[PDB]
Design a protein around this ligand. Structure first.
Ligand code: NA
Length: 286
């Protein structure tokens, strides 16, 4: 029994609200608001806690990292990252929380940090080949993938994808996506890595592509119902949920999900209390 948790984001104002979707009841409720306005953060579930990593508070990019205990319904801080980091991705690999890329107001970042919950310490990880802002991250089969993004220096959206091996501590390019996607939602389902939506310039994509590490190849799947950049993604009971994001007009309050066995996207009838892009999304136990 799972709750999908949606944390902060931009509405377009940076917000504190955290909402959870209850799959049995098919409805949203609010839980404890974030300690601060936070959008453009990484978000993972780890050791029973939701971690909101970095991002933007409406004025400044931040290095703060806050964790939510859903049994207590309370936010508390963990160690700050070395670097202020926004539009990053975050994922858990081998019990460590990786904070990948982003932007700090001045430059985009190839830098990567890893958090050890036992010692409450972040440490330096090998950097990516490319500096990627608005990057999406997912872990499949012991490897961590950094998908697309925006290359600040080149002022363009990226089609390239890279993969991190923790044993060798290096990032290597893998097969490119079919198209450039900054702000792609990235999620994993049945050992496939999905890249949903994103954008190349001001037009927002509804297209979706899936990567198989066994073939090192991408292929198209069904388009989403809405164009979405900077949507959150998670996987629940065989289905890939895409939450909010920006459609080129508004921050969406809608959620839709992909059924890989029918190659169909279905819009959830109940919307969030607020539209959100650049919101954290993860799944916890109810
Ligand atoms: Na930013």
């Amino acid at each position: 029994p799972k709750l999908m948790v949606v944390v902060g984001g931009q509405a377009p104002k940076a917000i504190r609200s955290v909402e959870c979707y209850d799959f049995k009841e098919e409805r949203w409720h609010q839980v404890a608001e974030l300690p601060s306005r936070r959008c453009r953060a990484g978000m993972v579930y780890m050791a029973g806690l939701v971690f909101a990593v970095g991002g933007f508070n409406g004025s400044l990019r931040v290095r703060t990292v806050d964790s939510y205990d859903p049994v207590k319904d309370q936010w508390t801080s963990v160690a700050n990252m070395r670097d202020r980091r926004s539009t990053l991705g975050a994922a858990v690999l081998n019990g460590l929380l990786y904070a990948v890329g982003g932007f700090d107001g001045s430059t985009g970042l190839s830098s990567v940090e890893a958090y050890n919950i036992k010692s409450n310490e972040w440490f330096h990880v090998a950097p990516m080949n490319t500096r990627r802002s608005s990057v999406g991250v997912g872990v499949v089969g012991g490897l961590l993938y950094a998908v697309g993004g925006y290359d600040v220096a080149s002022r363009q959206c990226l089609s390239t994808v890279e993969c991190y091996n923790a044993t060798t501590n290096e990032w290597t390019y893998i097969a490119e996506m079919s198209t450039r996607r900054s702000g792609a939602g990235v999620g994993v389902l049945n050992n496939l890595l999905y890249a949903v939506g994103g954008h190349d310039g001001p037009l927002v994509r509804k297209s979706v592509e899936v990567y198989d590490p066994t073939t090192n190849a991408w292929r198209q799947v069904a388009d989403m119902n809405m164009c979405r950049r900077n949507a959150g993604v998670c996987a629940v009971n065989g289905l890939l949920y895409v939450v909010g994001g920006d459609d080129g007009s508004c921050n969406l309050a809608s959620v839709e999900y992909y059924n890989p066995t029918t190659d169909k996207w279905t819009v959830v009838s109940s919307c969030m209390s607020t539209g959100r892009s650049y919101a954290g999304v993860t799944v916890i136990d109810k």
